[PDB]
Amino acid sequence: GSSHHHHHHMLDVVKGNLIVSCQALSDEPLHSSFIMGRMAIAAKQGGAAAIRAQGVNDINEIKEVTKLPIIGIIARNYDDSEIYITPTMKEVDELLKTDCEMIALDATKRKRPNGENVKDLVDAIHAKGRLAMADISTLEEGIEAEKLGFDCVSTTLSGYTPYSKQSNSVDFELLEELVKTVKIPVICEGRINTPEELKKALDLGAYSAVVGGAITRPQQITKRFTDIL
């Protein structure tokens, strides 16, 4: 098949710019597609180049009210896997019904629900002409993600798997190691709290970066204030 050509392409749009993650799961105070939409508007008006969002309802609302490029995920627990970021083809298919341009998925070394294989997920995303982002936790996972044909890798899961670096701050070391090894874009994502950290990520060769909670989780932002008192 064929389609009209667009002038702007998501990876070009986000290069050197900020992607804002606008998520609020069911146990979080801002949980509401309406609210996530308004948070994405705020992000757009503060200069965000793209949005990362969770679930079909939030993705569809954000797309409608901002018209920014979106990295879509579905976060879902399965009884037979530790993976929750877009774990199976079921989630991929659900996301492919939204207009999100990129789909991010856990691309860790771990077994997926139903014993599904990450390559099948990437291929399905590509079969619909969407981009795939590999959320990884280690250097080796990043290298493998490139081999599997992901369009980009993100450091999202560093510190969120038991075998990766345990840290409460941005994993710059993983970022540094990835950029000297893989050729595809490496996106810094996880625990960026300050502009100075964002700047550092880009200075170290991150293609782009994603900030979520330091912008869109006022509970977390509040806590970082109250923790100093």
Ligand X SMILES: CC(=O)N[C@H](C=O)[C@@H](O)[C@H](O)[C@H](O)COP(=O)(O)O
Pick the closer one to its own copies by CB: 153 or 214.
214
Residue closest to Cl ion, measured at CB: 219
* Residue 73 binds to ligand X (criterion: CB under 6 A): yes
Which of 39, 104, 157, 182: binder of its own copies (CB under 8 A)?
A: 39
CB atoms inside a 10 Å sphere around CB 141: 26
The enclosing H or E element of 195 equals helix 195-203
Residue 179: beta bridge partners?
A: none
Q: For the chain, where are the E strands, in sequence order?
A: 18-21, 50-54, 70-73, 102-106, 131-135, 152-154, 186-189, 208-211
* Residue 81 binds to its own copies (criterion: CB under 8 A): no
Backbone φ and ψ for 116, nearest 5 degrees, come out as -65, 155
Pick the closer one to its own copies by CB: 104 or 206.
206
Options 73-81, 117-125, 168-176, 210-218: segment touching its own copies (CB under 8 A): 210-218
CA dist., res. 186 & res. 165, Å (int): 18
* Residue 75 binds to its own copies (criterion: CB under 8 A): no
Task: Give the one entry of its own copies, Cl ion, ligand X, none that residue 81 binds, where binding means its C-beta sits below a cut-off of 5 to 8 angstroms depending on kind.
Answer: none
Contacts with ligand X: how many residues (CB under 6 A)?
16
Q: For 130-176, where are the E strands, in sequence order?
A: 131-135, 152-154
Which parts of this chain interact with its own copies (CB under 8 A)? 16-18, 20, 28-30, 32, 34-35, 38-39, 41-43, 45-48, 194-196, 198-199, 202, 211, 214-229
